[PDB]
Amino acid sequence: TKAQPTEVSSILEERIKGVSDEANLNETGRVLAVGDGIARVFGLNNIQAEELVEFSSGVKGMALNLEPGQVGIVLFGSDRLVKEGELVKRTGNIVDVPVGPGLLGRVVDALGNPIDGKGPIDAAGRSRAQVKAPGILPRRSVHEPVQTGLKAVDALVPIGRGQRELIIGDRQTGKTAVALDTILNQKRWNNGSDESKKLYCVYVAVGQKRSTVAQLVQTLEQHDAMKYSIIVAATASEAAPLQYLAPFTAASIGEWFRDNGKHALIVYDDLSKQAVAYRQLSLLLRRPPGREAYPGDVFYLHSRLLERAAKLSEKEGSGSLTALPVIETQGGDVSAYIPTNVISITDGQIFLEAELFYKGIRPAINVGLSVSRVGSAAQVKALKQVAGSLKLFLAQYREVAAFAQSDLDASTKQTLVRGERLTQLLKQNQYSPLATEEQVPLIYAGVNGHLDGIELSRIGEFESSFLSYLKSNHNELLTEIREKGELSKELLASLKSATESFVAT
Amino acid sequence: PPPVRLFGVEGTYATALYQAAAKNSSIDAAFQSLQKVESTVKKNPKLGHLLLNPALSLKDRNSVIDAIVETHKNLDGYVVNLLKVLSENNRLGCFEKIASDFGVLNDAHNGLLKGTVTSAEPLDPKSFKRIEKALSASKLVGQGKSLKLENVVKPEIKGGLIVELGDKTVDLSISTKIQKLNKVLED
Amino acid sequence: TPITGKVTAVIGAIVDVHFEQSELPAILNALEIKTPQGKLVLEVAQHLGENTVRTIAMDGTEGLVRGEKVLDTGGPISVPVGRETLGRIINVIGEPIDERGPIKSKLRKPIHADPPSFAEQSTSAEILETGIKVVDLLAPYARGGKIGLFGGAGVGKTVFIQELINNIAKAHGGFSVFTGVGERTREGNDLYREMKETGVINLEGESKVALVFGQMNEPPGARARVALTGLTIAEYFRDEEGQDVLLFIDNIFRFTQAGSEVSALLGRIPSAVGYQPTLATDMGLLQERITTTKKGSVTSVQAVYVPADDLTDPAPATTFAHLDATTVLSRGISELGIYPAVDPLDSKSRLLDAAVVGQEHYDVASKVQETLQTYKSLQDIIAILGMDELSEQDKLTVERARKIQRFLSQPFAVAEVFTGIPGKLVRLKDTVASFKAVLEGKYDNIPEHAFYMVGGIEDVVAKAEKLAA
């Protein structure tokens, strides 16, 4: 006829034997059938929705399905630990994770257990994992700088603080490095006394080898930068429900900084592995497969995660928390449900081409499929002026090379000469972050066509020599770009003159 | 768990009832009260057969229970809690089903075989007795298990006789012999 | 009235209540469950028997203690509408979330309403022009019409719509509604700011705009009834104020998507892909409440975030049914660098005709379509064997088509921020002349690059002088 959870013979036997089990089922439960990393518990009638429960196995779970007579907890933990008819006690609180200031230079897991084991986490509070996005009214436009040290990603992609900006590209191109370079570049920003010049960068590692992350941590401490950055970890080892809760928890920690008004940044690497995790969880919850077998609430998950990163209003102290979610594109095909969903949410994407990567640019920023919907201003005015038209130029090189494969018009050839020469200038090797002051003249040179004086072979020589030359000839110009942050007509002329001077030699 | 496992679906209620009242050792009492309420089911045929139909509310269902226990107070007490369960679970179609299941389960706990000697004719009482004697004589009855034996008339059994009890049958039929004949005299 | 219930289940934000009292709220009633954090408005969607309804919860469920008292607030949720909704940004509930304080509600109107009748239709045909050349040539709009846009949203998709707001709504005198379902909060903040700046919303004095904003953060169920909420405000303008309205919806894929999620939870077995079985009816009802009636003809702009550009996914397909014009926007054409990124063989309007917009316009468009179709047809052939190795007559056509494609590139006003190129809005009469000339190869004596990202024919000529330098 029908199957009801009370039909379970031991439960059924208590009801027959008089009735119930003395109101023990309002705040403690006893586990019923269990497996598939979800448990069905009898009682816990005072359970709050999305409460954290602690099982006597030590495993803690988030109530997901509140059903008449039974609750379907999701086990943040391994199955072997949990056993049937175990007594579940209510934590009594909605899932919260400790948040505070003393997570800078800490590796924690998703439960906030310090897996760096640099003692207990110094956390002011705990804050609920899910928190609503700031509305239209608490939002405020971005204008703060985020300089990545990668000229392309800092002259074709303007990034500022409190934004939502996608970083997308191909599997195991050491995808991480672009972000690592940003963290390094804003070392001197983060050596800045002003804490609106300090970023607190959170690296959420989802679905990555526990070994690889440990190498990264050591790398970060070699590059002396761990102390201004947080690492949240949800490794490959870590259980799929933990992985599901990992980005949300990380964003709570960031929000404590954000809600100090202080400027932060968070990199969620890789949400594609969250998609697989949510898929696993959903399928094991027997929720009907969505497209590409990825659940239908995957859009909801990502959108809730992403939209909690913001540049708050003046009232809220201009609470920056930049978001850079790192998507591992399926075969480099941006048509694909998970990538497209992210693209629509984010403002700007930074697609990278394998062909260019292979063709010796590490990093190799495809600019056909990199856009930044951050638009004009979010980076230094000097780097708006000099950067002027370069997006056009490299999409004129793109156009030129579209039809390059018959006869060439002098206009196309001139562009090809600029394009190729510009491409050499673009090239940057990993762990070479470039100062803002340094980026202005290089871009000036190419834009003002003074880079035709250099041949492709000698572009690299020109770059290093030019920077050394500028400093030796007059570091005054660069100091002006350092403080003024703008090129006065005199400074601009002086720079034109200076560029011409070096170009000549 | 208490003797004789029944894998009844909605018979899980009967199983539960059995073990629950076995552990309270009020099984004979249960069986008797169950007979009495079962009797009052048969003796309530209008709206006690014709309102075993699912259309009752929670509140209206409860009031059907209340009318039944007004009719008699001979109830196990555990089966009054079971009555509550059946009202709440709105188990009413498999209500006499549960009664039958508990009865079988109970009288199995007491020990009592069942049996039938389906035949193509209604055999003699002399036959019933002679066969019953024979069956008790055969090691099939080992005692602690009694017997019911009903010879039934079924035209379907063509040839022989068929004895059935304890999931052990001797099935004499004409059909199997006919079958062998047919097959070989066509091949 | 106080009609109690308890929350038996909370399977997502599709709570099930058991109204203890046999007095059972009817379907499409609204219920208030009181909570320490505000209240929750839930809407009865099924009666599952034994006085246990299953209710959509329009707010994000959490904290719920199993068995929570309910009170029945009855009927379809009645939003508050008015001239004092103009300026306001309103929550799904109707709460002014831009905190211009409470709406002085004249009429509070039910969320659910029925589309006007076949006889009540007043079928328009009045041309609405934008000044966007590609739009004008290929699929000219009509005021009161139903306009449609497809492809990846916020791929400048949002920007395209913003350009439409900039052009069309700064040429529309009546009211205008922007309703953004799953809107990007920063973009919304910018838009609100821009609107306030351009006086379209003016905090003091009247606003000829009203706003509904639905963030994609907000749970699916809330997003489902964002559309209906906006649609009610639109009805107040259409009917009660009478006045013709603009309407923007961005994106209605989010409406469909939300529906598919809740359908599963409701218990409805999911139809193909996963979509709600009631997809067609709901879309139909909604898009016929934006219809052209004797009481008002409401210009609608519908934006579909086509998922992975699967138009074959039934929801975009069924959008075409409820449209009179479409302007499917192609990612490929975006890759080709064209802004507007409009697919040129996948735009249509019924307004395009040889007498509706005249024979000359129609002939020009016909030739453009044919020329481009040839060029696309020979794309394989060209690549394997050069266009040099293809016919001379065709080679002229190919070169011409490359020019035409570039000619269609036109900068835009609020694209000016992103592109960095000052916008161009070119008169429709001018457009026909300009394209006609190009087709007659009059100006096909100058570079292909000249035609790229510029407005009128005169601009191309001037840019030839620029290129020459």
DSSP C72-133: E--SS-EEEESTTSBS-EE-SS--BTT-S-----SEEEES---PPPTTTB-----EE--S-H
C100: CB partners within 8 A, 6+ apart? C87, C88, C203
Q: Which chain B residue has its CA at the smallest distance from A69's CA?
A: B89
DSSP 3-state of C213 = strand
- Strands A370-371 and A349-350 come out as antiparallel
Q: Which of C182, C188, C467 is nearest residue A136 as measured by Cβ atoms?
A: C188
Q: What architecture (CATH level 2) is domain C77-351?
A: 3-Layer(aba) Sandwich (3.40)
> Which residues in chain A are contacts of B19 at CB distance < 8 A?
9, 13
Phi, psi of A474 (to 5 degrees): -175, 105
Q: CATH 3.30.1490.190: does it fit domain C1-76? A: no
* Residue that has been written with the tokens 């928890």 in this structure: A249
Chain B residues in contact with chain A using a Cβ-Cβ cutoff of 8 Å: 9-10, 12-13, 15-17, 19-21, 23-24, 78, 81-82, 84-85, 89, 91, 93-94
Instruction: Report which of C249, C261, C251, C211 is spatially closest to residue C57, judged by C-alpha positions.
Output: C261
CA distance C65 to chain B (A): 22
DSSP 3-state of A218 = helix
For residues A365 and A423, give the distance between their C-alpha atoms in angstroms, rounded to a whole number: 11
Look at C213 and A136 and tell me if their CB atoms are within 8 Å.
yes
* H or E stretch covering A349: strand A349-350
* H or E stretch covering C176: strand C175-183
Exposed/middle/buried for residue A483 (C-beta within 10 Å: 0-12, 13-18, 19+): exposed
Cis check: omega of the bond before A363, within 30 degrees of 0: yes
Domain at A61, CATH number? 2.40.30.20
- In the DSSP assignment, the letter for residue A312 is B
Q: Which chain B residue has its CA at the smallest distance from C21's CA?
A: B59
**Amino acid letter, A23:** A
Dihedral class, residue C372 (left if φ above 0, else alpha if ψ from -120 to 50, else beta): alpha
Instruction: Report which of C234, C342, C341, C337 is spatially closest to residue C288, judged by C-alpha positions.
Output: C234
CB atoms within 10 A of CB A211: 11
Q: Which of C98, C216, C337 is nearest residue A137 as measured by Cβ atoms?
A: C98
Sign of CA dihedral A311, A313, A314, A316: negative
**Amino acid letter, A407:** D
Look at C185 and A139 and tell me if their CB atoms are within 8 Å.
yes
Which residue stretches of A127-239 are H helix? Answer: 177-185, 210-222
A384: CB partners within 8 A, 6+ apart? A158, A376, A377
Dihedral class, residue A235 (left if φ above 0, else alpha if ψ from -120 to 50, else beta): beta
Domain at A308, CATH number? 3.40.50.300
> Which residues in chain A are contacts of C8 at CB distance < 8 A?
68
DSSP 3-state of A324 = strand
Torsion, Cα of A99, A105, A107, A111 (10° steps): -10
CA distance B136 to chain C (A): 54
A169: CB partners within 8 A, 6+ apart? A175, A327, A328, A329, A332, A350, A351, A352
Interface test with B, best of A16, A19, A20, A21 (most B CBs within 10 A): A16
Instruction: Report which of C213, C229, C224 is spatially closest to residue C253, judged by C-alpha positions.
Output: C224
**Amino acid letter, C209:** V
A222: CB partners within 8 A, 6+ apart? none
Is C169:C176 a contact under the CB 8 Å cutoff?
Answer: yes
Look at A15 and B84 and tell me if their CB atoms are within 8 Å.
yes
For residues B130 and B124, give the distance between their C-alpha atoms in angstroms, rounded to a whole number: 9
Is B18:B102 a contact under the CB 8 Å cutoff?
Answer: yes
Is C13:C56 a contact under the CB 8 Å cutoff?
Answer: yes
Mark whether A219 and A258 lie in a shared domain. yes
Buried b (16+ CB within 10 A) or exposed e, A70-81: bbbbbbbbebee
Is C19:C5 a contact under the CB 8 Å cutoff?
Answer: yes
Host domain of residue A170: 94-379
A331 reaches C (C-beta below 8 A): no
For residues C164 and C167, give the distance between their C-alpha atoms in angstroms, rounded to a whole number: 5
Dihedral class, residue C337 (left if φ above 0, else alpha if ψ from -120 to 50, else beta): left
DSSP 3-state of C334 = helix
CA distance A57 to chain B (A): 27
The tokens of C272 are what? 């193909």
For residues B120 and B118, give the distance between their C-alpha atoms in angstroms, rounded to a whole number: 7
DSSP 3-state of A67 = strand
- In the DSSP assignment, the letter for residue C288 is T
Exposed/middle/buried for residue A227 (C-beta within 10 Å: 0-12, 13-18, 19+): exposed
Structure determination technique employed: cryo-EM
Mark whether A290 and A181 lie in a shared domain. yes
Phi, psi of C441 (to 5 degrees): 65, 20
Chain breaks in chain C (C to N over 2.5 A) after: none
Q: Rounded to the nearest 5 degrees, what angle is found at the Cα of A57, between the Cα atoms of A3 and A278?
A: 65
Cα C222 from chain centroid (whole Å): 18
Exposed/middle/buried for residue C384 (C-beta within 10 Å: 0-12, 13-18, 19+): exposed
C35: CB partners within 8 A, 6+ apart? C63, C68
Instruction: Report which of C351, C290, C370 is spatially closest to residue C322, judged by C-alpha positions.
Output: C290
Is C371:C439 a contact under the CB 8 Å cutoff?
Answer: yes
Is C281:C140 a contact under the CB 8 Å cutoff?
Answer: no
CB atoms within 10 A of CB C8: 22
Beta-sheet strand order (sheet of C175-183):
C89-90, C209-215, C175-183, C245-250, C299-303, C146-150, C325-329, C342-349
Domain at B64, CATH number? 1.10.520.20
DSSP 3-state of C145 = coil
CA-atom Rg of chain C in angstroms: 25
- Strands A229-234 and A201-206 come out as parallel
A10 reaches C (C-beta below 8 A): no
Q: What architecture (CATH level 2) is domain C352-469?
A: Orthogonal Bundle (1.10)
CB atoms within 10 A of CB A496: 15
Paired with C128 in beta bridges are C141
Touching partners of C (3+ C-beta pairs < 8 Å): A, B
Look at A7 and B21 and tell me if their CB atoms are within 8 Å.
no
For residues C178 and C301, give the distance between their C-alpha atoms in angstroms, rounded to a whole number: 10
Measure Cα distances from A74 to A77, A246, A422, C3 in Å.
Answer: 9, 14, 54, 34
Instruction: Report which of A160, A130, A135 is spatially closest to residue A305, judged by C-alpha positions.
Output: A130
The tokens of C135 are what? 């739009």
* Residue that has been written with the tokens 């540049």 in this structure: A311
> Which residues in chain A are contacts of B9 at CB distance < 8 A?
1
> Which residues in chain B are contacts of A6 at CB distance < 8 A?
85, 89
Host domain of residue B46: 11-110
- The DSSP secondary structure of C336-379, one letter per residue, reads TT-SS-EEEEEEEETT-STTTTTHHHHHHHHHHHHHHHHHHHTH
Q: List, by residue number, the catalytic residues of A.
A: 373
DSSP 3-state of A276 = helix
A208 is known to lie in a ligand binding site: no
CB atoms within 10 A of CB A398: 16
For residues A246 and A232, give the distance between their C-alpha atoms in angstroms, rounded to a whole number: 8
In chain A, what is the greatest distance between 2 CA atoms, to the nearest angstrom? 101
Look at C186 and A303 and tell me if their CB atoms are within 8 Å.
no
CB atoms within 10 A of CB C416: 17
Mark whether A287 and A429 lie in a shared domain. no
Instruction: Report which of A2, C46, A20, C66 is spatially closest to residue B90, judged by C-alpha positions.
Output: A2
The tokens of C326 are what? 């479409």
In a domain, A15, yes or no: no
Q: List, by residue number, the catalytic residues of C.
A: 157, 183-184
Q: Rounded to the nearest 5 degrees, what angle is found at the Cα of A381, between the Cα atoms of A375 and A384?
A: 50
Mark whether A271 and A342 lie in a shared domain. yes
A212 is known to lie in a ligand binding site: no
Q: Which of A360, A379, A398 is the last residue of a domain?
A: A379
In a domain, A8, yes or no: no
Paired with C303 in beta bridges are C149, C250
- The DSSP secondary structure of A482-496, one letter per residue, reads HHT-S--HHHHHHHH
Helices A337-345 and A298-306: crossing angle in degrees, nearest 10, is: 30
CA distance C19 to chain B (A): 12
A187: CB partners within 8 A, 6+ apart? A224, A225, A228
Cis check: omega of the bond before A270, within 30 degrees of 0: yes
Exposed/middle/buried for residue A236 (C-beta within 10 Å: 0-12, 13-18, 19+): middle
B57 reaches C (C-beta below 8 A): yes
Q: Which of A12, A17, A18 is nearest residue B13 as measured by Cβ atoms?
A: A12
Instruction: Report which of C431, C407, C405 is spatially closest to residue C344, judged by C-alpha positions.
Output: C405
**Amino acid letter, A445:** A
Torsion, Cα of B60, B65, B71, B75 (10° steps): -170
- Strands C325-329 and C342-349 come out as antiparallel
- The DSSP secondary structure of A10-31, one letter per residue, reads HHHHHHHTSSS-TTGGGTEEEE
The tokens of C228 are what? 């209906």
Q: Which residues of C are annotated as a binding site for ATP?
A: 151-158
Mark whether A112 and A229 lie in a shared domain. yes
For residues C469 and C453, give the distance between their C-alpha atoms in angstroms, rounded to a whole number: 18
The tokens of C313 are what? 């996914």
Chains A and C: how many Cβ contacts under 8 Å?
A: 157
Is C279:C271 a contact under the CB 8 Å cutoff?
Answer: yes
Interface of B with C in 125-184 (CB under 8 A): none
Look at B12 and A4 and tell me if their CB atoms are within 8 Å.
no
Count of alpha carbons within 13 angstroms of residue A297, beta-carbon side: 21
Helices A271-284 and A240-258: crossing angle in degrees, nearest 10, is: 130
Touching partners of B (3+ C-beta pairs < 8 Å): A, C
The tokens of A331 are what? 């075969």
For residues C155 and C149, give the distance between their C-alpha atoms in angstroms, rounded to a whole number: 12
For residues C48 and C51, give the distance between their C-alpha atoms in angstroms, rounded to a whole number: 7
For residues C77 and C42, give the distance between their C-alpha atoms in angstroms, rounded to a whole number: 9
For residues A394 and A371, give the distance between their C-alpha atoms in angstroms, rounded to a whole number: 13
Q: Which residues of C are annotated as a binding site?
A: 151-158
CA distance C110 to chain A (A): 25
Count of alpha carbons within 13 angstroms of residue A88, beta-carbon side: 36
Look at B12 and A6 and tell me if their CB atoms are within 8 Å.
no
The tokens of B160 are what? 């022989």
> Which residues in chain A are contacts of B13 at CB distance < 8 A?
7, 12
Cα C201 from chain centroid (whole Å): 20
Domain count across chain A: 3
Paired with A349 in beta bridges are A371
> Which residues in chain A are contacts of B52 at CB distance < 8 A?
none
Mark whether A274 and A409 lie in a shared domain. no
Is A354:A362 a contact under the CB 8 Å cutoff?
Answer: no
For residues A416 and A401, give the distance between their C-alpha atoms in angstroms, rounded to a whole number: 8
Chains B and C: how many Cβ contacts under 8 Å?
A: 5
CA distance B98 to chain A (A): 13
Phi, psi of A202 (to 5 degrees): -115, 135
Cα C427 from chain centroid (whole Å): 24
Look at B20 and A17 and tell me if their CB atoms are within 8 Å.
yes
A412 is known to lie in a ligand binding site: no
CA distance A15 to chain B (A): 7
In chain C, domain spans:
1-76, 77-351, 352-469
The tokens of B81 are what? 């809690």
A40 reaches C (C-beta below 8 A): no
Mark whether A109 and A87 lie in a shared domain. no
* Residue that has been written with the tokens 């039910």 in this structure: C110
Resolution (in Å) of the shown entry? Answer: 6.3
**Amino acid letter, C195:** M
B58 reaches C (C-beta below 8 A): yes
A449 reaches C (C-beta below 8 A): no
* H or E stretch covering C177: strand C175-183
Count of alpha carbons within 13 angstroms of residue A9, beta-carbon side: 18
A265: CB partners within 8 A, 6+ apart? A146, A161, A182, A186, A199, A200, A201, A202, A320, A321, A322, A323, A324
Instruction: Report which of A256, A258, A311, A348 is spatially closest to residue A145, judged by C-alpha positions.
Output: A311
Count of alpha carbons within 13 angstroms of residue A82, beta-carbon side: 27
For residues A51 and A95, give the distance between their C-alpha atoms in angstroms, rounded to a whole number: 6
Buried b (16+ CB within 10 A) or exposed e, A11-50: bbbbbbbeeeeeeebeebbbbbebeebbbbbbbbbebbbb
For residues C177 and C163, give the distance between their C-alpha atoms in angstroms, rounded to a whole number: 15
